[PDB]
Curated annotation (Swiss-Prot), chain B:
Lineage: Eukaryota, Metazoa, Chordata, Craniata, Vertebrata
Transmembrane annotation, as ranges: none
Family stated for the protein in its record: Belongs to the protein kinase superfamily. Tyr protein kinase family. ABL subfamily.
Summary of subunit composition and partner proteins: Interacts with SORBS1 following insulin stimulation. Found in a trimolecular complex containing CDK5 and CABLES1. Interacts with CABLES1 and PSTPIP1. Interacts with ZDHHC16, ITGB1 and HCK. Interacts with STX17; probably phosphorylates STX17. Interacts with INPPL1/SHIP2. Interacts with ABI1, ABI2, BCR, CRK, FGR, FYN, HCK, LYN, PSMA7 RAD9A, RAD51, RAD52, TP73 and WASF3.
Modified residues (Phosphotyrosine): 8, 19, 52, 65, 95
Tissue expression summary: Widely expressed.
Localisation per UniProt entry: Cytoplasm, Cytoskeleton; Nucleus; Mitochondrion
Underlying gene: ABL1
Post-translational modification: Polyubiquitinated. Polyubiquitination of ABL1 leads to degradation.
Disease connection: Leukemia, chronic myeloid: A clonal myeloproliferative disorder of a pluripotent stem cell with a specific cytogenetic abnormality, the Philadelphia chromosome (Ph), involving myeloid, erythroid, megakaryocytic, B-lymphoid, and sometimes T-lymphoid cells, but not marrow fibroblasts. A chromosomal aberration involving ABL1 has been found in patients with chronic myeloid leukemia. Translocation t(9;22)(q34;q11) with BCR. The translocation produces a BCR-ABL found also in acute myeloid leukemia (AML) and acute lymphoblastic leukemia (ALL).
Name of the protein described by the UniProt record: Tyrosine-protein kinase ABL1
Cited function: Non-receptor tyrosine-protein kinase that plays a role in many key processes linked to cell growth and survival such as cytoskeleton remodeling in response to extracellular stimuli, cell motility and adhesion, receptor endocytosis, autophagy, DNA damage response and apoptosis. Coordinates actin remodeling through tyrosine phosphorylation of proteins controlling cytoskeleton dynamics like WASF3 (involved in branch formation); ANXA1 (involved in membrane anchoring); DBN1, DBNL, CTTN, RAPH1 and ENAH (involved in signaling); or MAPT and PXN (microtubule-binding proteins).
Domain SH2: 7-97
């Protein structure tokens, strides 16, 4: 039910994460990734990744903190296709 | 069978909907039912870092609408329409919030 799929932390230190995901078959314009402390009502950061790529590095994180990380395929037909952006939580 | 839509989050408060959209981008949204009043639904929508909430109205003839000019037989038709054109909403309904 998610697009992209298989959002994973590939490698981690206490202040950075390398994330990967599996792109949809349909070409994506670019991706937007948000990340922020789980449970926060605000604070979340955002950045862009080209549509040809399916990894990113998130840096400048705090050790021991549970982050909610979400990847959006910008302009993808989520509503038409009945999909949602993919999200995971990862601590530290 | 509403619950089978990615955008339909069931009973959720206004403030909980804002929490569910914290991780969102422009056009992140969800549809919710009242936790106080069964059958009473709203759309919550993120735009430029703020969450906007819209009552789903029911007309005297049963049609559903968020904007008076655009009335629908079903909630799914309403959401599909406003995913393409804002039509009174501050922006379009593009990214269903992940369910938590």
């Amino acid at each position: 039910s998610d697009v992209p799929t298989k959002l994973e932390v590939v490698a981690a230190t206490p202040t950075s994460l390398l994330i990967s995901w599996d792109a949809p078959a349909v070409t994506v314009d670019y991706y937007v990734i948000t990340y922020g402390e789980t449970g926060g009502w605000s604070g979340y950061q955002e950045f862009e990744v080209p549509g040809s790529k399916s990894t990113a590095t998130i840096s400048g994180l705090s050790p021991g903190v549970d982050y909610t990380i979400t990847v959006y395929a910008y302009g993808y037909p989520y509503v038409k296709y009945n999909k949602s952006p993919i999200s995971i939580n990862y601590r530290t | 069978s509403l619950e089978k839509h990615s955008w339909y989050h069931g009973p959720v408060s206004r403030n909980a909907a804002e929490y569910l959209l914290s991780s969102g981008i422009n056009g992140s949204f969800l549809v919710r039912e009242s936790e106080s009043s069964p059958g009473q639904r709203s759309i919550s929508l993120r735009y430029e870092g703020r969450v906007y909430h819209y009552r789903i109205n029911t007309a005297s003839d049963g049609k559903l609408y968020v904007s008076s000019e655009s009335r629908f037989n079903t909630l799914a038709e309403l959401v599909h329409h406003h995913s393409t054109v804002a039509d009174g909403l501050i922006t379009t309904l593009h990214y269903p919030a992940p369910k938590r």
